[PDB]
Design an enzyme around this catalytic site. Structure first.
Site, PDB file in Angstrom:
ATOM      1  N   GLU D  49       0.922  -1.125   0.000  1.00 53.98           N
ATOM      2  CA  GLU D  49       0.000   0.000   0.000  1.00 53.98           C
ATOM      3  C   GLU D  49       0.966   1.178   0.000  1.00 53.98           C
ATOM      4  O   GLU D  49       1.787   1.318   0.909  1.00 53.98           O
ATOM      5  CB  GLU D  49      -0.890   0.065   1.236  1.00 53.98           C
ATOM      6  N   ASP D  60      -4.743  11.094   7.743  1.00 53.36           N
ATOM      7  CA  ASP D  60      -3.546  10.576   8.402  1.00 53.36           C
ATOM      8  C   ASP D  60      -3.175  11.173   9.762  1.00 53.36           C
ATOM      9  O   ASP D  60      -3.637  12.249  10.140  1.00 53.36           O
ATOM     10  CB  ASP D  60      -2.353  10.710   7.452  1.00 53.36           C
ATOM     11  N   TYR D 175     -10.721  -2.823   3.260  1.00 55.90           N
ATOM     12  CA  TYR D 175      -9.838  -2.272   4.283  1.00 55.90           C
ATOM     13  C   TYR D 175     -10.634  -2.143   5.577  1.00 55.90           C
ATOM     14  O   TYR D 175     -11.443  -1.226   5.737  1.00 55.90           O
ATOM     15  CB  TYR D 175      -9.315  -0.907   3.837  1.00 55.90           C
TER      16      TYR D 175
END
Ligand SMILES: *Cc1c(COP(=O)(O)O)cnc(C)c1O
Ligand SMILES: *Cc1c(COP(=O)(O)O)cnc(C)c1O
Ligand code: NA
Ligand code: NA
Lengths: 392, 251, 392, 251
Positions: D49, D60, D175
């Site tokens: 990834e 993030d 995911y």
């Protein structure tokens, strides 16, 4: 000879050099005429409403009084254009100046905000404004000097004498003694020679009038007491005026206690001064044993006036109004408390009044009382002062 | 006493005008001030106008504002001023002595007590700078009870009612700042002394020619002091020179 | 799925990580419910009136327009508690937070005044407020940091990344992604992911509503145009909203031109940017050729937002509203002009809007036009900025 | 291509879980990054990834925020990232390569053009961090037209409607951040990879034991890079050690 009584009991008068008497008589006459002129009143009301932002709010402070039987409201003069109650009367005096056919304004200031107030009113009404201030004060008041100059006022530094406020005042009055035909002296508080104490009160009384209407609307009755700080006396007499004949309403004036009355470093002449003659009036003042005028002290520059308005001295003498004092530390605590619990940053001057209301509540938490504190101004200007103190 | 009355009678017999200089007591110091005053007298001053340093002299101008500064810097107090006044009178028995005061220093410990103190030291008149005729009652009453002449200023913007009040309330002399002089005489006012911008001999002769009984130099003397602070000897020399010239102009 | 349309034409949307969608859906639902709840409305109106000082005045500026056929009014948001229009919607969002049963507020700020606004509303309503701000911003914003801390807010310096605003925002949203059940993210402008653009507009629309009523009362007709500065878009959409259906009323948005559009140093993404996806929305933005978000520039920090609210982009696309730009120098001149001629010190942000009205007047002085400028805030905070510039 | 499908089939025949490490392309530099990636692969990573540095990565955390900082400081751009991607694919023909993007970098020059570029360089999947299933239509449509697997995150606060959407819209793998795994399998969702806090061997075995097809280490790799910036050789050594241990835990 005058149209109105220049005295409040033994306090007040017109103790100025003979040369200034015609200027005072002229002003008194214009004022009496203006007070009876609906057009002047309508014009004054229009400016207060559409330019200054009147009426100001009356805010209830539930968070501060939680757990007690005190109900507290704050008269929001801090929301007035300019950030303080001073705006009300300078606009009124500017209109009087125009009524007399004058196009110039004279004022003097030190660390106060009266210069900015005089300058903004002069800019709005097309008046040429000149403000005197001691050279020493100019060097320490860069921010306000800039504000006044941005607003077109001519700031005149005074180097004569000790180059301080008293020298600026002297120069301003000397100026006025020769130019009163075309210029008006804008006094910034309810003190000095008649007719100023009366004029300033009348041009600040909407504070008390609005408060009366707002409290009756919200609580259905009058306050048990209205509380206001007292430097010169204008915001306090403005709040008090409309309540004087309401015998059940307590009038509490708060003078600065500075570092403490016993330290001698305070600004409480009404309760700890001595009657004298100064600045055109007979009134309580800070003075030496042999008659020299002493300086007042307070963490708040705005309450740094060595004397007090004559009407306050009178109201006190007959027991109609009560005066107390609040120290620098007490005012600082009130300042912090209002910020944290109501989200309002109060002027340190106004904080003295809030500090006393807080004491009335805390000392007797189960006493039922409806109080109104006159929040005379906002405290953005005091953030640095308070920051440095807390720092150390 | 009747020092002013006696002075003007003497000046009249000599077809002479009076020249009165003003100075601040204690400027620049007690000792130098006493010398200054003795010099003014020796040089020909017919009378004296003396100021007592006050913290907030709202009336006076920069020259005087700085005079008080110098006096306070020397630690001069009203009590010391009265000590000087007694000394001055002990040395000069007939010259009229007038004080220029601010209301608070007169009111402070009691108006009556103040004028009693003036009478005790030998002062002849008191002009209270910030007390208009309208507020003068207790002051003039106390002055008269103690044989002190209350003096009033007749301003430029004076009207007829004021002229009559000043004529009625004043004693010693009228502090003036042709028609005014005639009206004052018409109302039997105390002799008028011209006090506006008196700084040259020609102004003194002009004042007398206009009908005034004399002239008062309100700041010219102080300026000379301010200019010669570095040399006390030269200060006295220039003061003697100026006063002598001003007095000559009155004869 | 949503209750309201998340888009205005192709602009808007909800471009956030999946984990934040429930928080947005929850907020949209609470808002829709609150908008239909008379009690919420009454409570919100009470705070705006008795705490913030609404309604604000509408001031006519005769001195500025003398000699021309332009009539100019200023909507006085500078008189609102706090000194700027931001107060209106933070109070509304704080009430929404309480409606959802939350007791915590999350916000982030750099050089803006959104932190102070979020902190004061939180103090008033008893909400625990935490404000994120880049470490670098903390070091340069001592005054506001102190104001927020005085008001009980917890200021959290962010050291991660470049320690700037974008890092604070990231931290705040990360925080919110895990604590939305008990905390509400207070977005400070009419941008970001739906429902914020809609909520902020609705909680600022009283600006336009009051202006409509005040202009009709004073002039007996609607304005030829309402003018407002555009950083993120809240004060402008607040003024515009109630006028959108009044086709005859021009809506003029003013973006900062900085040193000049051609210099590349400006903050005018709506007219000189490029459509992109950022901060949860699709909208015009300042970006590099390959898609990195660029910084906007303006002498006024408040207009330093690299994008613009989606509804503005939409109003522009259909030609309902027109957007222009004003440079640093043009804004500075307007600032000086208002101070000198009206006695009002305007925020530099608001000065951009005034600068454009001044241009409309001066370019065609014989054109008859009734204009209203939204004076979004006061400029006491800009005195130093302006002083130093004029200095050099 | 069908790299993910082929990988999972192979892992299944071996009753093995997949271990997927994430790293930012160009961190701390283009050259060192290519070496890092080759090391991850040699050590046993089943897939990759890879993130493309973006100015405002609102999703993030600090570790990644600092990773982008390092990458930008090295002058890394999306164009250079695609150059790296082509090189990586030329060296490793079968390992699945997934990108972790932010919407603007995909939308910037045209969504379709972006996925066409991905197909051209040999990328297999793209997870757009700030595009929820609700806004994903144009992205997943473009991905599919170019044989790219659109990947979606199944959050903790996921409900049943979201599970169905993710099962329907996703490809390659889901995911994930026991019931969720069963429901996803029930809805025929792409194989699920656990991506929450995967930083130790026991977490990898736990994920597989829970029913997931593997685990994604979202930041553990970046932390190792951040810690060994001073010694590139030691950085690669520790990365090989960590990945090898994590992969062993999947067998
Ligand atoms: C000037 C000022 C005062 C003091 O003046 P008063 O004449 O005694 O009212 C008090 N509060 C504020 C905020 C002021 O600006
Ligand atoms: C915050 C601010 C602005 C900019 O915000 P918008 O959301 O674009 O309105 C404009 N004026 C003032 C005074 C501000 O405080
Ligand atoms: Na006082
Ligand atoms: Na913008």
């Amino acid at each position: 000879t005058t149209l109105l009584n220049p005295y409040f009991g033994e306090f007040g008068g017109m103790y100025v050099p003979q040369i200034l008497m015609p200027a005072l008589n002229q002003l008194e006459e214009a004022f009496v005429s203006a007070q009876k002129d609906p057009e002047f009143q309508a014009q004054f009301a229009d400016l207060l409403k559409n330019y200054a932002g009147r009426p100001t709010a009356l805010t209830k402070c539930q968070n501060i009084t939680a757990g007690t039987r005190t109900t507290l409201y704050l008269k929001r003069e801090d929301l007035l254009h300019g950030g303080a109650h001073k705006t009300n009367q300078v606009l009124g005096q500017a209109l009087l100046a125009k009524r007399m056919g004058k196009s110039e304004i004279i004022a003097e200031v030190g660390a106060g905000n009266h210069g900015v107030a005089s300058a903004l009113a002069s800019a709005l009404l097309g008046l040429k404004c000149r403000i005197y201030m001691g050279a020493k004060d100019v060097e320490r008041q860069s921010p306000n000097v800039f504000r006044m100059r941005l607003m077109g006022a001519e700031v005149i530094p005074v180097h004569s004498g000790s180059a301080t406020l008293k020298d600026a005042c002297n120069e301003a009055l000397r100026d006025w003694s020769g130019s009163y035909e075309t210029a008006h002296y804008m006094l910034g508080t309810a003190a000095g020679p008649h007719p100023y104490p009366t004029i300033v009160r009348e041009f600040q009384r909407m504070i008390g009038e609005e408060t009366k209407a707002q409290i009756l609307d919200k609580e259905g009755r009058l306050p048990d007491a209205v509380i206001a700080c007292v430097g010169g006396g204008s915001n306090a007499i403005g709040m008090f005026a409309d309540f004087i004949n309401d015998t059940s309403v307590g009038l509490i004036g708060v003078e600065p206690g500075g570092h403490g009355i016993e330290t001698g470093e305070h600004g409480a002449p009404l309760k700890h001064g001595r009657v004298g003659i100064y600045f055109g009036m007979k009134a309580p003042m800070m003075q030496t044993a042999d008659g020299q005028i002493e300086e007042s002290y307070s963490i708040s520059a705005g309450l740094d006036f060595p004397s007090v308005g004559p009407q306050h001295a009178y109201l006190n003498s007959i027991g109609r109004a009560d005066y107390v004092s609040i120290t620098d530390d007490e005012a600082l605590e009130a300042f912090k408390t209002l910020c944290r619990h109501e989200g309002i940053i109060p002027a340190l001057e106004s904080s003295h009044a809030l500090a006393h209301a807080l004491k009335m509540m805390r000392e007797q938490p189960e006493k039922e009382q409806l109080l109104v504190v006159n929040l005379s101004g906002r405290g953005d200007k005091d953030i640095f002062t308070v920051h440095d103190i807390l720092k150390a | 006493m009747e020092r002013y009355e006696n002075l003007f009678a003497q000046l009249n017999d000599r077809r002479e005008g009076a020249f009165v200089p003003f100075v601040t007591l204690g400027d620049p110091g007690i000792e130098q001030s006493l010398k200054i005053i003795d010099t003014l007298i020796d040089a020909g001053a017919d009378a004296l106008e003396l100021g007592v340093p006050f913290s907030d002299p709202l009336a006076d101008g920069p020259t005087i504002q700085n005079a008080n500064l110098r006096a306070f810097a020397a630690g001069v107090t009203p009590a010391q001023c009265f000590e000087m006044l007694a000394i001055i009178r002990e040395k000069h028995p007939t010259i009229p002595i007038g004080l220029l005061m601010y209301a608070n220093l007169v009111f402070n410990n009691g108006i009556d007590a103040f004028y009693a103190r003036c009478e005790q030291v030998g002062v002849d008149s008191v002009l209270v700078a910030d007390v208009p005729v309208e507020e003068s009652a207790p002051f003039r009453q106390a002055a008269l009870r103690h044989n002190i002449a209350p003096i009033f200023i007749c301003p430029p913007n004076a009207d007829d009612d004021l002229l009559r009040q000043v004529a009625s309330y004043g004693r010693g002399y009228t502090y003036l700042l042709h028609h005014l002089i005639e009206k004052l005489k018409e109302y039997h006012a105390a002799p008028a002394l011209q006090g506006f911008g008196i700084s040259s001999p020609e102004q003194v002769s002009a004042a007398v020619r206009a009908g005034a009984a004399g002239a008062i130099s309100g700041s010219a003397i102080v300026k000379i002091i301010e200019k010669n602070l570095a040399s006390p000897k030269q200060m006295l020399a220039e003061l003697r020179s100026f006063v002598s010239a001003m007095k000559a102009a009155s004869r």
